[PDB]
């Protein structure tokens, strides 16, 4: 019933998150100079290191807001290939379903936390 804790439990699935080879492409913005239509297509970039630096700044709330965006991620990855079988958006397909494996407990037990403290 902590309801700081998400905050430290995202950190450190953040931590795995960088470990990961497939999450290589989405730690920095997109170069201009090698995908010059990338914001023709994608209105709100979203990265991991913006992710982590927003978490850090004491910037989110709720792990909901974090999932947001992470999930912002993903769904730039999807609007921005060309093909479902491009290999950054394959790889973007594997590191959410890492996500959301290990994100349902940190949103479970924080809504619980929550609604204990109302109880
Ligand atoms: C082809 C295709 C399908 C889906 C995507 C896609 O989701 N992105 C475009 C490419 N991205 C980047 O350039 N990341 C920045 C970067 C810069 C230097 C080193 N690592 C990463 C990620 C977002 O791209």
Same mark, same amino acid.
């Given at each position: 019933?902590?309801? &700081?804790?998400?905050?430290? &439990?995202?950190? !450190? $699935?953040? /931590?795995?998150?960088? &470990? @990961?080879?497939?999450? !290589?492409?989405?730690?920095?913005?997109?170069?201009?100079? !090698?995908?010059? =239509?990338?914001?023709?297509?994608? =209105?709100?970039?979203?990265?991991?290191?913006?992710?982590?630096?927003?978490? !850090?700044?004491? /910037?989110?709330?709720?792990?909901?807001?974090? @999932?947001?965006?992470?999930?912002?991620?993903? %769904? /730039?990855?999807?609007?921005?290939?060309?093909?479902?079988?491009?290999?950054?958006?394959?790889?973007?397909?594997? $590191?959410?379903?890492?996500?959301?494996?290990?994100?349902?407990?940190?949103? %479970?037990?924080?809504?619980?936390? $929550?609604?204990?403290?109302?109880?």
């Amino acid at each position: 019933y902590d309801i &700081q804790a998400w905050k430290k &439990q995202c950190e !450190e $699935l953040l /931590n795995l998150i960088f &470990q @990961c080879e497939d999450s !290589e492409p989405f730690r920095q913005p997109v170069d201009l100079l !090698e995908y010059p =239509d990338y914001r023709d297509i994608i =209105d709100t970039p979203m990265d991991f290191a913006t992710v982590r630096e927003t978490l !850090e700044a004491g /910037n989110y709330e709720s792990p909901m807001e974090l @999932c947001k965006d992470v999930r912002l991620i993903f %769904s /730039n990855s999807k609007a921005y290939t060309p093909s479902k079988r491009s290999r950054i958006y394959s790889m973007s397909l594997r $590191l959410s379903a890492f996500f959301e494996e290990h994100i349902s407990s940190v949103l %479970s037990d924080y809504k619980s936390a $929550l609604r204990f403290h109302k109880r």
